[PDB]
Motif scaffolding. Sequence first.
Motif, PDB file in Angstrom:
ATOM      1  N   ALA A  11       0.846  -1.157   0.053  1.00  0.00           N
ATOM      2  CA  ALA A  11       0.038  -0.081   0.068  1.00  0.00           C
ATOM      3  C   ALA A  11       0.707   1.293  -0.028  1.00  0.00           C
ATOM      4  O   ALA A  11       0.554   2.410  -0.508  1.00  0.00           O
ATOM      5  CB  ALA A  11      -0.888   0.016   1.240  1.00  0.00           C
ATOM      6  N   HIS A  12       1.933   1.190   0.479  1.00  0.00           N
ATOM      7  CA  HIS A  12       2.947   2.078   0.475  1.00  0.00           C
ATOM      8  C   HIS A  12       4.085   1.862   0.177  1.00  0.00           C
ATOM      9  O   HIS A  12       5.206   1.656   0.858  1.00  0.00           O
ATOM     10  CB  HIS A  12       3.109   2.745   1.961  1.00  0.00           C
ATOM     11  N   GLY A  13       4.353   1.668  -1.386  1.00  0.00           N
ATOM     12  CA  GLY A  13       3.393   2.125  -2.371  1.00  0.00           C
ATOM     13  C   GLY A  13       3.410   3.476  -2.536  1.00  0.00           C
ATOM     14  O   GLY A  13       4.302   4.195  -2.563  1.00  0.00           O
ATOM     15  N   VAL A  14       2.113   3.839  -3.004  1.00  0.00           N
ATOM     16  CA  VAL A  14       1.795   5.102  -3.395  1.00  0.00           C
ATOM     17  C   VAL A  14       0.684   5.748  -2.349  1.00  0.00           C
ATOM     18  O   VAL A  14       0.093   6.945  -2.822  1.00  0.00           O
ATOM     19  CB  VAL A  14       1.503   5.576  -4.955  1.00  0.00           C
ATOM     20  N   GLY A  15       0.631   5.255  -1.024  1.00  0.00           N
ATOM     21  CA  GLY A  15      -0.144   5.761  -0.155  1.00  0.00           C
ATOM     22  C   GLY A  15      -0.149   7.145   0.318  1.00  0.00           C
ATOM     23  O   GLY A  15      -1.060   7.914  -0.129  1.00  0.00           O
ATOM     24  N   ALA A  16       1.120   7.564   0.755  1.00  0.00           N
ATOM     25  CA  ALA A  16       1.358   8.841   1.464  1.00  0.00           C
ATOM     26  C   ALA A  16       1.617   9.700   0.135  1.00  0.00           C
ATOM     27  O   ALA A  16       0.959  10.910   0.098  1.00  0.00           O
ATOM     28  CB  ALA A  16       2.477   8.818   2.513  1.00  0.00           C
ATOM     29  N   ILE A  17       2.340   9.286  -0.719  1.00  0.00           N
ATOM     30  CA  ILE A  17       2.856   9.852  -1.815  1.00  0.00           C
ATOM     31  C   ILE A  17       1.640  10.684  -2.574  1.00  0.00           C
ATOM     32  O   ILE A  17       1.538  11.767  -3.065  1.00  0.00           O
ATOM     33  CB  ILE A  17       3.521   9.298  -3.008  1.00  0.00           C
ATOM     34  N   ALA A  18       0.261   9.752  -2.603  1.00  0.00           N
ATOM     35  CA  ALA A  18      -0.976  10.167  -3.334  1.00  0.00           C
ATOM     36  C   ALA A  18      -1.280  11.342  -2.526  1.00  0.00           C
ATOM     37  O   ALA A  18      -1.939  12.431  -3.302  1.00  0.00           O
ATOM     38  CB  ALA A  18      -2.003   8.988  -2.906  1.00  0.00           C
TER      39      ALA A  18
END
Length: 21
Positions: A11-18
């Motif tokens: 999920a992180h990933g692009v979780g925070a980056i999103a």
Amino acid sequence: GLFGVLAKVAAHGVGAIAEHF
């Protein structure tokens, strides 16, 4: 347990980056 954490990595990933973009 530790198994549920395996998904956290994916999920992180692009979780925070999103939240940024």
